[PDB]
Amino acid sequence: EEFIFRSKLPDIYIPKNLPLHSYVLENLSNHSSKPCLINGANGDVYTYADVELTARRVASGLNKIGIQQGDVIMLFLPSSPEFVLAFLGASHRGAIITAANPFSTPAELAKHAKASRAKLLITQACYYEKVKDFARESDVKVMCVDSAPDGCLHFSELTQADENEAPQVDISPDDVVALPYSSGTTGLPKGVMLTHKGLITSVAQQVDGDNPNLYFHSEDVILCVLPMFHIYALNSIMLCGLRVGAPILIMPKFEIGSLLGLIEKYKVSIAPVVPPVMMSIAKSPDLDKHDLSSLRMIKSGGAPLGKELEDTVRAKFPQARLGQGYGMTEAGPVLAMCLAFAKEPFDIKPGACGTVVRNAEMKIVDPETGASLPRNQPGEICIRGDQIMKGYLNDPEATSRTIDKEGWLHTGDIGYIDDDDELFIVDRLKELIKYKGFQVAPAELEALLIAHPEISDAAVVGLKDEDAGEVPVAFVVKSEKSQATEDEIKQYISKQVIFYKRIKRVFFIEAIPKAPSGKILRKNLKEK
């Protein structure tokens, strides 16, 4: 704690005795009849007044079917109005929301539902069969938003419930409200506990204050094509958008053609994106078949854009201001944010990662010594503030090695801050693999591979890739006499995992390089 970095923006007032829903919808009356949630795929619309009232009904409904304060509700849905209504609804009830990609496999879903100890599952009928077995066998209530196969509940039982019967709840600021899963700096997916105070803090750091880090014009329309089941989109787009009363145009499924049409149609002006989608948008031959002049800002994150794409986007969307931010689930998840988006913008440099958010502290430590480093000195990025997670669910050791004794969250990312307080990420210490912006845990794939009868050891590492950034490859030690082939192993994994967790190549070896403790020498592997 010698060299401590902060935002170039002054600290602001942040409520510390308010529940998340009360905070994000605090200034509802100024725009109560204004559009809040718009479903770009079917035109559904919910005004601000509609969301506030329905949230309370969802709370009454949840109670009615037995969901109590502290209970975990699992969402198995695509980005949508229903997702937000279920979330805000759970927040009003004092319940917790955990979410998973609807494209997950039954095994992945059951594991998630089991670990999170979800009492209720909300999804769509086209995904019902993937939870059908697990459901009955675990006495977990299943609910669908469209049809209601078998005996599962319908979502109108929550949205149409009597608000007057919404239970009386005393939400404490330190009560958990969001439970996203993340592998963190090492190992298997773990439950990240995010509190009311934590999230309110994070939203405030991004959009509150006389000179907000992210400024909104009254005519702005923010796009939500990023997945709501990932906290980054639910926070930076939905919660932040609601907080400032902006209309949010949601896209359940990404399709270049429709998106461009939607941008002209609804006058989309703020486009939150990740490198992969931005790259798809940039390669579109139909950019001139649509009026995209309403676009004034391309907000990127999740992974680096790269100098080339950065230049490409800047060239193909001269009407918009391009900027990049940086987040990590356990951090709330926003750590740094592009100050070129502030009401009174600051200059930013190419490749920049943004500036550490206000009402927070950031330092850079020598991964070895642990000493704090000064400007322009690469090291591990650490952040501290009320916005970071409370810890991992039922996993004290994990928490203890991610958040140190002085409250600093260790990201496992290597970067440095320059004289202009702009953060630059240059390397990654943790084993985390990111394919298409999605997180892929080597330990998870490794466990699946090793469970195979003909495999005695395995290691999964990231292989640099143009289209996805990193593709997972696997080094495998076959058991004696095994004649299993690469394709046979790859299909073995593919059947059990969601699309982005497929291993692209299998390299057979006689032994996985390991340190005395058993830690895989991953750089030793990558070095190959």
Ligand X SMILES: Nc1ncnc2c1ncn2[C@@H]1O[C@H](COP(=O)(O)O)[C@@H](O)[C@H]1O
Give the residue ranges of the annotated binding site for AMP: 230, 325, 327, 329, 413, 430, 434, 439
Residue 357 corresponds to which amino acid? V
Residue placing its CB nearer to ligand X in the complex, 91 or 236: 236
Contact characters 341-360, ligand X, x per CB under 6 A: ------------x-------
Q: Tell me whether strands 297-300 and 321-324 are parallel, antiparallel or unpaired.
A: parallel
Pick the binder of ligand X from 5, 317, 326, 392 (CB under 6 A): 326
Task: List, edge to edge, every strand of the sheet that includes 355-356.
Answer: 326-327, 334-337, 355-356
Residue list for the binding site: 230, 325, 327, 329, 413, 430, 434, 439
Sequence-ordered list of residues with C-beta below 8 angstroms from that of 344, at least 6 positions apart, any chain: 211
The C-alpha atoms of residue 23 and residue 245 are separated, in whole angstroms, by 12
The single-letter DSSP state of residue 77 is -
In sequence order, the β-bridge partners of residue 46 are: 37
Based on the shown chain and the rule CB under 6 A, indicate whether residue 446 belongs to the binding site for ligand X. no
Question: Does 202 interact with ligand X (rule: CB under 6 A)?
Answer: no
292: how many CB neighbours lie within 10 A of its CB?
Answer: 19
Applying CB under 6 A, does 213 fall inside the site for ligand X?
no
CA 476 to the chain's CA centroid: 31
288-317 residues near ligand X, rule: CB under 6 A? 301-304
Q: Determine, following the binding rule CB under 6 A, whether residue 324 of this chain makes contact with ligand X.
A: yes
Q: Which residue is nearest to ligand X (CB)?
A: 329
Give, as ranges, the residues between 168 and 197 that touch ligand X (CB under 6 A): 182
Q: Which residue, 63 or 439, is less far from ligand X as judged by CB? A: 439
Instruction: Establish if 413 lies at the interface with ligand X (CB under 6 A).
Output: yes
Burial 397-416 (b: 16+ CB within 10 A, else e): ebbeebbeeeebbbbbbbbb
Binding mask 81-120 for ligand X (x = CB under 6 A): ----------------------------------------
Q: Per-residue contact track with ligand X, 245 to 284, x per CB under 6 A?
A: ----------------------------------------
Which lies closer to ligand X via its Cβ, residue 182 or residue 202? 182
Sheet holding 297-300, edge to edge: 45-47, 35-39, 248-250, 222-224, 270-273, 297-300, 321-324
- Which residue's structure tokens are 């993937």? 130
User: Structure tokens of 438?
Assistant: 């999605």
Q: Position 75: which residue type?
A: L
The nearer residue to ligand X, 310 or 413, going by C-beta atoms, is: 413
Estimate the share of the chain in helix, then strand, then coil, as percent rounded to the nearest 5. Answer: 30, 25, 45
Binding-site member from 123, 205, 269, 411 for ligand X (CB under 6 A): 411
Q: Of the ranges 63-71, 259-267, 427-435, 513-521, which one interacts with ligand X (CB under 6 A)? A: 427-435
Measured distance CA(297)–CA(287) in Å, rounded: 16
Q: Which of 116, 205, 329, 402 binds ligand X (CB under 6 A)?
A: 329
Residue ranges binding ligand X (CB under 6 A): 182, 232, 301-304, 324, 326-329, 333, 353, 411, 413, 425, 428, 432, 434, 439
